[PDB]
Amino acid sequence: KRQWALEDFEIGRPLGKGKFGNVYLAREKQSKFILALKVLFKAQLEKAGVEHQLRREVEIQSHLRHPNILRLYGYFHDATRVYLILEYAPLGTVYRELQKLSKFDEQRTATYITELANALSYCHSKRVIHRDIKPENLLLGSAGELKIADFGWSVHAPSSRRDTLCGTLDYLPPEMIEGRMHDEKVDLWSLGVLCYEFLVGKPPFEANTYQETYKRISRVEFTFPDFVTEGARDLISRLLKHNPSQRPMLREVLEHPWITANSSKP
Amino acid sequence: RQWALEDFEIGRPLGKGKFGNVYLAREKQSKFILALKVLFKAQLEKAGVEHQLRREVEIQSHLRHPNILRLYGYFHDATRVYLILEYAPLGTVYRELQKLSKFDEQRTATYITELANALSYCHSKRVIHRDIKPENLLLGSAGELKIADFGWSVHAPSSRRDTLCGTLDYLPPEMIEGRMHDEKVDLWSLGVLCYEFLVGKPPFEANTYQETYKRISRVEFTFPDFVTEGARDLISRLLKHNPSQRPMLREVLEHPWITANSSKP
Amino acid sequence: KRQWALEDFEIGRPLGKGKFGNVYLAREKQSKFILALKVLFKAQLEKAGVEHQLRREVEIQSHLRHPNILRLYGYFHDATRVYLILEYAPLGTVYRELQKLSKFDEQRTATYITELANALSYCHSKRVIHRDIKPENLLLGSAGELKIADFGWSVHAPSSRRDTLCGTLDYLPPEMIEGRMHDEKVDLWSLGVLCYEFLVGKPPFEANTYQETYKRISRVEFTFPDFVTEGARDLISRLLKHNPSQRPMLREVLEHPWITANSSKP
Amino acid sequence: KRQWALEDFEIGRPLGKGKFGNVYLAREKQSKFILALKVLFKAQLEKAGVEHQLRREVEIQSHLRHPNILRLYGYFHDATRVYLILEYAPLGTVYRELQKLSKFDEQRTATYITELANALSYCHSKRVIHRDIKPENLLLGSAGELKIADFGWSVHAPSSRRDTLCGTLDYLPPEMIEGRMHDEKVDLWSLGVLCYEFLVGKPPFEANTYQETYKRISRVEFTFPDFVTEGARDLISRLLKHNPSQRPMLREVLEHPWITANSSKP
């Protein structure tokens, strides 16, 4: 419950250069507190009409508190730009980490799904569906812990909104790409897509064209490489079911044999 | 008594605090020289310190001690509030430290003495300052120390997590860990202060809030070679993680180094 | 492989005040490296004739490298004192933490015995027996990890040295107090005593007199409070066997059901 | 290609006192040539080792010719001590001048980085990496020109040597402190750290402890004061990248907009 401005901050090196605007390392001058400064040029926001989406991000991501959900501290607008004041994630994104390791072992994967399942559970309990779970949106804290960020696309559940689908639809479920009514079960589908990608290096329905990925997700056409263990095959196949009602609850996922067998964090 | 702004002739800016600035002022009918702390209601209400300010006025106006900066009264304009404070002719101990870099053992010893007296009086009427730093220590006409800014002071013991907005260089472990704290907070601060006076910087200074949090938590501090053994003793006594193992203000006042170097009993 | 002196260091607050001399926080001036400075007054060392065991500590503790064994960096002697340059353990001793929590849960205990068993295994493989395993000699690293220190009483195994037994013989095994020949199995007895104390708050043979503790250790007379679980009772009873040859190996301890069931670190 | 001895020189005032031994002003008796005499006591060299590094300094620094690289003329060993016969730098070190001015303007900085980038470019072309670029090792010639000295830590690139890391990791890059394989890109990182320090008065990762500075360099955590211009922020941020492959080449540095805009020497 405070008021900020740019002269309150000392800005450091670029952290990552998202679409909309870039992210910098920053320090609150009076407390020397290290955080990150997400800078968005008003022009590319208003012209692309995400001016409702940004406000949804700030509202939701600032009223949530969980160790596995990246904190948003406050916001402030310049004459030309907007500034989101975010928690700083020392170890960057899970996406870059996967670029570095190619694929994850069952223990890193298991733990990432566990931490991510906890953040999602807390999210659903306050009735929030993220809808945009992808490794570009998973940051890592100081101890290498997972932290969900970018709640721009999250809404209150259930929902029936066909938002202008601008991203690769790799992590979107059938119900969402078919513009239908979806609930919190979206994030379970995403969680499955994500477990598979962590273990294999690519998402299960990856393709060379939007339309073909649409066909693959629609018909749920995915195959495991030989090296995916039977336990991982179980959890993933459970999570990737066409009907949302046949997908497990986050508690069944947290209690799945494979998960507890390989996860280091309970 | 009741005051208003037309009762004063306002002079030069003395120091420009964050909420509002401080001016030199003169009560027109008596020609009495004091200071006028002007606070814009806007930056106060929106930052929600409207309880803290009232705490400052209550406490600092019912206290009397030569080493505690007097508050005379207050009055509110349609815009802003005005605190009528005692004038401190030699400015802050903070600017004095900026000018001299570091203090000698005699200036330090004496500042800790005067400050220990003000704190002792404060505890006896059950008051904990919690925000002891050199920006809040002013100097009287004879160079005497004068504690000011009781905004963050409360009655002891307490268990309030106040929105920690400032650098936590002078805060003790119990306070940064949002735990229950009593009057021993000011002893920790007093140690941090003795060190800074002698060295030029506080013992847990750092480049980030989180790192200073780590250093205060684990009490990680080291003396330069020039800090004498006596100062090392008093400071190490004062900087103990457990509040119950910190001395009382009387042990501090009676410490060997203190009496050996302090000019004011 | 370097030469040190006191003027190389900026000395900080007292960390703990041992009997021979005290321990201070210190910083290597040129590199700003944080460590600890153990200061021993030559007088109390020569007159108590521990001038061989000190040299044994420096030799052994400086040629050992293990994450769970506190590093000794070097040493240097003043005209009046000696200075051991040690690794700094941010979270103090396991002894003070036991004072703070009264007793440990099965998970903290299990993990402490695990880390401690790893350090001991490494120690035995280079044929080193500590002989003085007690919570006052277990320090905690930055992440809360256990770190064995104080190798003064450690010798090469096997051994048949009586040594002027000071201390208090709570953690000593029957063979050592009976001045007999002991091997590496001493540290297994100690490990058992330590597991019990972690779980209960006191060592199993604690008493009001040296002679009475001698009788209790000799006859292995110890009883569990009701709250000690069956699994812990098993591991402890195995470790506390009069004949060294009937005590498990560090691998059987590391693989014990209770241990893996409750330990967080493999 | 000549033989020297101490009786060949008239020795003058102490110039600076650099740990291994001090530096004096000297004059070659027959030619009256003014130079400097670095005197090193064999004792503090052999016992600390570095008897390989010193020979590395003499080899490399004596076979290099560049206006911005401090010449080494020859060497000779006394029964006690060794004597390096070096070029004399009339205006002392960049380190003492930084102490005197607190911080540098964009013109002094730009030019120092230019001269330094030229010396480094020449160094890489004969495949030499300095690895120890710091203001204490930059001397100033008669006309205020920058002159790199102290090539003891310089090796041929690439390398994979964990040298006993002393001094201070203020100018070392992540790859070097993590004991990994490093190439010529070490000196680009150093160059960035150096530009920042010239402009700000302190290095970007300065800290109160070795371990904390290690964390900051590792995660590349640095912030600009308000007064650092956008151009300087660009060049510094380019130079301070965790991955060596993403750092510019010395030609991109020499051709950077900020540099040419403010550098007086082409």
PDB file of C-alpha atoms in Angstrom, chain B residues 66-260:
ATOM      1  CA  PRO B  66      18.064  17.377  27.936  1.00  0.00           C
ATOM      2  CA  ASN B  67      19.112  14.685  25.477  1.00  0.00           C
ATOM      3  CA  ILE B  68      15.626  14.254  23.981  1.00  0.00           C
ATOM      4  CA  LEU B  69      14.530  16.823  21.395  1.00  0.00           C
ATOM      5  CA  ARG B  70      11.411  18.585  22.665  1.00  0.00           C
ATOM      6  CA  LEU B  71       8.169  18.815  20.728  1.00  0.00           C
ATOM      7  CA  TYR B  72       6.232  21.945  21.671  1.00  0.00           C
ATOM      8  CA  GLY B  73       2.880  21.430  19.949  1.00  0.00           C
ATOM      9  CA  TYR B  74       1.212  20.840  16.577  1.00  0.00           C
ATOM     10  CA  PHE B  75      -1.381  22.391  14.267  1.00  0.00           C
ATOM     11  CA  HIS B  76      -3.104  21.414  11.003  1.00  0.00           C
ATOM     12  CA  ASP B  77      -3.598  23.556   7.901  1.00  0.00           C
ATOM     13  CA  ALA B  78      -6.193  22.732   5.202  1.00  0.00           C
ATOM     14  CA  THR B  79      -3.113  21.404   3.423  1.00  0.00           C
ATOM     15  CA  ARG B  80      -0.285  20.011   5.590  1.00  0.00           C
ATOM     16  CA  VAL B  81       0.378  19.669   9.313  1.00  0.00           C
ATOM     17  CA  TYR B  82       2.968  21.594  11.334  1.00  0.00           C
ATOM     18  CA  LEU B  83       5.065  20.128  14.146  1.00  0.00           C
ATOM     19  CA  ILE B  84       6.651  22.776  16.359  1.00  0.00           C
ATOM     20  CA  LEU B  85      10.000  21.320  17.453  1.00  0.00           C
ATOM     21  CA  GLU B  86      12.996  22.343  19.536  1.00  0.00           C
ATOM     22  CA  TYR B  87      15.743  23.827  17.350  1.00  0.00           C
ATOM     23  CA  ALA B  88      19.056  21.921  17.193  1.00  0.00           C
ATOM     24  CA  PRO B  89      21.730  24.537  16.276  1.00  0.00           C
ATOM     25  CA  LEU B  90      24.448  22.092  15.162  1.00  0.00           C
ATOM     26  CA  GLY B  91      22.321  19.905  12.897  1.00  0.00           C
ATOM     27  CA  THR B  92      22.430  16.115  12.789  1.00  0.00           C
ATOM     28  CA  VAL B  93      25.027  13.648  14.018  1.00  0.00           C
ATOM     29  CA  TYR B  94      24.663  12.188  10.530  1.00  0.00           C
ATOM     30  CA  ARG B  95      26.009  15.287   8.766  1.00  0.00           C
ATOM     31  CA  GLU B  96      28.649  15.610  11.491  1.00  0.00           C
ATOM     32  CA  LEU B  97      29.773  12.063  10.655  1.00  0.00           C
ATOM     33  CA  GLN B  98      29.753  12.943   6.935  1.00  0.00           C
ATOM     34  CA  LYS B  99      32.101  15.834   7.688  1.00  0.00           C
ATOM     35  CA  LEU B 100      34.539  14.000  10.000  1.00  0.00           C
ATOM     36  CA  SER B 101      34.323  10.544   8.334  1.00  0.00           C
ATOM     37  CA  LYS B 102      34.821   8.824  11.688  1.00  0.00           C
ATOM     38  CA  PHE B 103      34.668   9.918  15.346  1.00  0.00           C
ATOM     39  CA  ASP B 104      37.395   9.641  17.989  1.00  0.00           C
ATOM     40  CA  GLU B 105      36.845   7.539  21.112  1.00  0.00           C
ATOM     41  CA  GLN B 106      35.994  10.632  23.162  1.00  0.00           C
ATOM     42  CA  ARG B 107      33.265  12.011  20.910  1.00  0.00           C
ATOM     43  CA  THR B 108      31.914   8.495  20.475  1.00  0.00           C
ATOM     44  CA  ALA B 109      32.070   7.646  24.163  1.00  0.00           C
ATOM     45  CA  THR B 110      30.271  10.856  25.024  1.00  0.00           C
ATOM     46  CA  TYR B 111      27.564  10.372  22.372  1.00  0.00           C
ATOM     47  CA  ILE B 112      26.852   6.877  23.670  1.00  0.00           C
ATOM     48  CA  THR B 113      26.728   8.262  27.217  1.00  0.00           C
ATOM     49  CA  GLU B 114      24.257  11.071  26.466  1.00  0.00           C
ATOM     50  CA  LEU B 115      22.280   8.671  24.268  1.00  0.00           C
ATOM     51  CA  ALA B 116      22.261   6.050  27.015  1.00  0.00           C
ATOM     52  CA  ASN B 117      20.869   8.633  29.430  1.00  0.00           C
ATOM     53  CA  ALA B 118      18.080   9.649  27.039  1.00  0.00           C
ATOM     54  CA  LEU B 119      17.271   5.983  26.439  1.00  0.00           C
ATOM     55  CA  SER B 120      17.281   5.168  30.160  1.00  0.00           C
ATOM     56  CA  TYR B 121      14.746   7.923  30.795  1.00  0.00           C
ATOM     57  CA  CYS B 122      12.773   6.591  27.822  1.00  0.00           C
ATOM     58  CA  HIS B 123      12.622   3.042  29.195  1.00  0.00           C
ATOM     59  CA  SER B 124      11.685   4.223  32.689  1.00  0.00           C
ATOM     60  CA  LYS B 125       8.493   5.708  31.230  1.00  0.00           C
ATOM     61  CA  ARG B 126       8.300   2.490  29.185  1.00  0.00           C
ATOM     62  CA  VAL B 127       9.180   3.830  25.725  1.00  0.00           C
ATOM     63  CA  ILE B 128      11.145   1.995  23.019  1.00  0.00           C
ATOM     64  CA  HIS B 129      12.433   4.114  20.141  1.00  0.00           C
ATOM     65  CA  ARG B 130      13.207   1.233  17.741  1.00  0.00           C
ATOM     66  CA  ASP B 131      14.563   3.687  15.129  1.00  0.00           C
ATOM     67  CA  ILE B 132      17.923   4.842  16.500  1.00  0.00           C
ATOM     68  CA  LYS B 133      20.139   6.026  13.636  1.00  0.00           C
ATOM     69  CA  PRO B 134      22.447   9.024  13.183  1.00  0.00           C
ATOM     70  CA  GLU B 135      19.878  10.796  10.976  1.00  0.00           C
ATOM     71  CA  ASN B 136      17.659  10.989  14.080  1.00  0.00           C
ATOM     72  CA  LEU B 137      20.306  12.297  16.465  1.00  0.00           C
ATOM     73  CA  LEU B 138      20.524  16.085  16.543  1.00  0.00           C
ATOM     74  CA  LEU B 139      23.075  18.313  18.273  1.00  0.00           C
ATOM     75  CA  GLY B 140      22.164  21.047  20.759  1.00  0.00           C
ATOM     76  CA  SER B 141      23.897  24.403  21.218  1.00  0.00           C
ATOM     77  CA  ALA B 142      26.747  22.936  23.284  1.00  0.00           C
ATOM     78  CA  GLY B 143      27.200  19.921  20.996  1.00  0.00           C
ATOM     79  CA  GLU B 144      24.974  17.727  23.177  1.00  0.00           C
ATOM     80  CA  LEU B 145      23.152  14.769  21.627  1.00  0.00           C
ATOM     81  CA  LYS B 146      19.367  14.969  21.252  1.00  0.00           C
ATOM     82  CA  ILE B 147      17.190  12.014  20.150  1.00  0.00           C
ATOM     83  CA  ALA B 148      14.403  12.979  17.729  1.00  0.00           C
ATOM     84  CA  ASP B 149      11.830  11.412  15.401  1.00  0.00           C
ATOM     85  CA  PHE B 150       9.835   9.132  17.703  1.00  0.00           C
ATOM     86  CA  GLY B 151       7.528   8.163  14.839  1.00  0.00           C
ATOM     87  CA  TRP B 152       8.402   4.472  15.102  1.00  0.00           C
ATOM     88  CA  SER B 153       8.519   4.315  18.900  1.00  0.00           C
ATOM     89  CA  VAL B 154       5.912   2.204  20.700  1.00  0.00           C
ATOM     90  CA  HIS B 155       5.198   0.978  24.218  1.00  0.00           C
ATOM     91  CA  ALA B 156       7.108  -2.134  25.241  1.00  0.00           C
ATOM     92  CA  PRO B 157       6.897  -4.995  24.758  1.00  0.00           C
ATOM     93  CA  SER B 158       5.476  -5.173  21.231  1.00  0.00           C
ATOM     94  CA  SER B 159       4.832  -7.606  18.373  1.00  0.00           C
ATOM     95  CA  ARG B 160       4.033  -5.374  15.398  1.00  0.00           C
ATOM     96  CA  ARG B 161       5.334  -6.027  11.892  1.00  0.00           C
ATOM     97  CA  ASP B 162       5.345  -2.450  10.624  1.00  0.00           C
ATOM     98  CA  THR B 163       5.865  -2.117   6.880  1.00  0.00           C
ATOM     99  CA  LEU B 164       9.686  -2.050   7.063  1.00  0.00           C
ATOM    100  CA  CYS B 165      10.395   0.662   4.492  1.00  0.00           C
ATOM    101  CA  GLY B 166      13.846   1.892   5.527  1.00  0.00           C
ATOM    102  CA  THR B 167      17.291   0.337   5.336  1.00  0.00           C
ATOM    103  CA  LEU B 168      17.463  -2.092   8.245  1.00  0.00           C
ATOM    104  CA  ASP B 169      21.100  -1.340   9.169  1.00  0.00           C
ATOM    105  CA  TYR B 170      20.166  -0.380  12.747  1.00  0.00           C
ATOM    106  CA  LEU B 171      17.366  -2.934  13.270  1.00  0.00           C
ATOM    107  CA  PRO B 172      18.080  -6.012  15.417  1.00  0.00           C
ATOM    108  CA  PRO B 173      17.438  -9.636  14.425  1.00  0.00           C
ATOM    109  CA  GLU B 174      14.220  -9.871  16.453  1.00  0.00           C
ATOM    110  CA  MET B 175      12.715  -6.909  14.590  1.00  0.00           C
ATOM    111  CA  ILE B 176      13.617  -7.907  11.026  1.00  0.00           C
ATOM    112  CA  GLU B 177      12.358 -11.424  11.719  1.00  0.00           C
ATOM    113  CA  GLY B 178       9.045  -9.784  12.663  1.00  0.00           C
ATOM    114  CA  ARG B 179       9.269 -11.349  16.128  1.00  0.00           C
ATOM    115  CA  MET B 180       8.434 -10.048  19.600  1.00  0.00           C
ATOM    116  CA  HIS B 181      10.813  -7.339  20.780  1.00  0.00           C
ATOM    117  CA  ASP B 182      11.200  -5.319  23.969  1.00  0.00           C
ATOM    118  CA  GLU B 183      13.409  -2.429  25.097  1.00  0.00           C
ATOM    119  CA  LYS B 184      16.544  -4.380  24.158  1.00  0.00           C
ATOM    120  CA  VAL B 185      16.070  -3.176  20.582  1.00  0.00           C
ATOM    121  CA  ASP B 186      17.642   0.147  21.498  1.00  0.00           C
ATOM    122  CA  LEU B 187      20.674  -1.569  23.010  1.00  0.00           C
ATOM    123  CA  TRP B 188      21.337  -3.349  19.725  1.00  0.00           C
ATOM    124  CA  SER B 189      20.906  -0.035  17.921  1.00  0.00           C
ATOM    125  CA  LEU B 190      23.248   1.599  20.420  1.00  0.00           C
ATOM    126  CA  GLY B 191      25.917  -0.959  19.576  1.00  0.00           C
ATOM    127  CA  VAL B 192      25.429  -0.481  15.846  1.00  0.00           C
ATOM    128  CA  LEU B 193      25.721   3.205  16.503  1.00  0.00           C
ATOM    129  CA  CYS B 194      28.912   3.036  18.551  1.00  0.00           C
ATOM    130  CA  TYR B 195      30.487   0.986  15.800  1.00  0.00           C
ATOM    131  CA  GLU B 196      29.401   3.393  13.058  1.00  0.00           C
ATOM    132  CA  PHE B 197      30.651   6.423  15.017  1.00  0.00           C
ATOM    133  CA  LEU B 198      34.045   4.746  15.393  1.00  0.00           C
ATOM    134  CA  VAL B 199      34.318   3.253  11.880  1.00  0.00           C
ATOM    135  CA  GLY B 200      32.281   5.506   9.591  1.00  0.00           C
ATOM    136  CA  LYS B 201      29.932   2.717   8.522  1.00  0.00           C
ATOM    137  CA  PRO B 202      27.505   0.417  10.361  1.00  0.00           C
ATOM    138  CA  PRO B 203      28.702  -3.136  11.147  1.00  0.00           C
ATOM    139  CA  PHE B 204      26.252  -4.934   8.806  1.00  0.00           C
ATOM    140  CA  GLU B 205      26.310  -2.489   5.893  1.00  0.00           C
ATOM    141  CA  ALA B 206      25.862  -4.056   2.480  1.00  0.00           C
ATOM    142  CA  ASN B 207      24.784  -3.446  -1.099  1.00  0.00           C
ATOM    143  CA  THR B 208      21.390  -5.127  -0.817  1.00  0.00           C
ATOM    144  CA  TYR B 209      18.534  -5.281   1.708  1.00  0.00           C
ATOM    145  CA  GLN B 210      18.473  -9.074   1.627  1.00  0.00           C
ATOM    146  CA  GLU B 211      22.217  -9.390   2.216  1.00  0.00           C
ATOM    147  CA  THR B 212      22.080  -6.927   5.126  1.00  0.00           C
ATOM    148  CA  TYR B 213      19.259  -9.127   6.380  1.00  0.00           C
ATOM    149  CA  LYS B 214      21.594 -12.130   6.264  1.00  0.00           C
ATOM    150  CA  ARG B 215      24.390 -10.262   8.043  1.00  0.00           C
ATOM    151  CA  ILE B 216      22.158  -8.924  10.853  1.00  0.00           C
ATOM    152  CA  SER B 217      20.496 -12.299  11.227  1.00  0.00           C
ATOM    153  CA  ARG B 218      23.781 -14.153  11.682  1.00  0.00           C
ATOM    154  CA  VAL B 219      25.417 -11.168  13.393  1.00  0.00           C
ATOM    155  CA  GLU B 220      28.341 -11.172  10.949  1.00  0.00           C
ATOM    156  CA  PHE B 221      30.570  -8.159  11.612  1.00  0.00           C
ATOM    157  CA  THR B 222      34.334  -7.515  11.792  1.00  0.00           C
ATOM    158  CA  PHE B 223      36.416  -4.690  13.287  1.00  0.00           C
ATOM    159  CA  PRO B 224      39.047  -2.786  11.327  1.00  0.00           C
ATOM    160  CA  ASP B 225      42.476  -2.798  12.993  1.00  0.00           C
ATOM    161  CA  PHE B 226      42.032   0.673  14.502  1.00  0.00           C
ATOM    162  CA  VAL B 227      39.066  -0.163  16.746  1.00  0.00           C
ATOM    163  CA  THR B 228      40.519  -0.442  20.229  1.00  0.00           C
ATOM    164  CA  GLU B 229      40.056  -3.504  22.429  1.00  0.00           C
ATOM    165  CA  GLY B 230      37.762  -1.602  24.800  1.00  0.00           C
ATOM    166  CA  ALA B 231      35.437  -0.537  22.005  1.00  0.00           C
ATOM    167  CA  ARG B 232      35.502  -4.094  20.688  1.00  0.00           C
ATOM    168  CA  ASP B 233      34.323  -5.235  24.124  1.00  0.00           C
ATOM    169  CA  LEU B 234      31.382  -2.812  24.469  1.00  0.00           C
ATOM    170  CA  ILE B 235      30.231  -3.250  20.865  1.00  0.00           C
ATOM    171  CA  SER B 236      30.395  -7.078  20.990  1.00  0.00           C
ATOM    172  CA  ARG B 237      28.429  -7.036  24.246  1.00  0.00           C
ATOM    173  CA  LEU B 238      25.769  -4.834  22.675  1.00  0.00           C
ATOM    174  CA  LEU B 239      25.543  -6.871  19.459  1.00  0.00           C
ATOM    175  CA  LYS B 240      24.266 -10.217  20.718  1.00  0.00           C
ATOM    176  CA  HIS B 241      21.546 -12.164  18.903  1.00  0.00           C
ATOM    177  CA  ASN B 242      19.617 -12.908  22.098  1.00  0.00           C
ATOM    178  CA  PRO B 243      18.191  -9.705  23.695  1.00  0.00           C
ATOM    179  CA  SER B 244      18.611 -11.154  27.209  1.00  0.00           C
ATOM    180  CA  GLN B 245      22.396 -11.294  26.775  1.00  0.00           C
ATOM    181  CA  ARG B 246      22.708  -7.586  25.953  1.00  0.00           C
ATOM    182  CA  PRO B 247      23.740  -5.335  28.864  1.00  0.00           C
ATOM    183  CA  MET B 248      21.458  -2.848  30.601  1.00  0.00           C
ATOM    184  CA  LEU B 249      21.928   0.861  29.954  1.00  0.00           C
ATOM    185  CA  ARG B 250      23.617   1.070  33.370  1.00  0.00           C
ATOM    186  CA  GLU B 251      26.269  -1.477  32.479  1.00  0.00           C
ATOM    187  CA  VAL B 252      26.851   0.497  29.283  1.00  0.00           C
ATOM    188  CA  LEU B 253      27.116   3.749  31.211  1.00  0.00           C
ATOM    189  CA  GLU B 254      29.501   2.062  33.668  1.00  0.00           C
ATOM    190  CA  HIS B 255      31.595   0.226  31.077  1.00  0.00           C
ATOM    191  CA  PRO B 256      35.392   0.879  31.476  1.00  0.00           C
ATOM    192  CA  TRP B 257      35.923   2.287  27.960  1.00  0.00           C
ATOM    193  CA  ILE B 258      32.914   4.611  28.341  1.00  0.00           C
ATOM    194  CA  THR B 259      33.961   6.284  31.616  1.00  0.00           C
ATOM    195  CA  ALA B 260      37.583   6.318  30.498  1.00  0.00           C
TER     196      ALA B 260
END
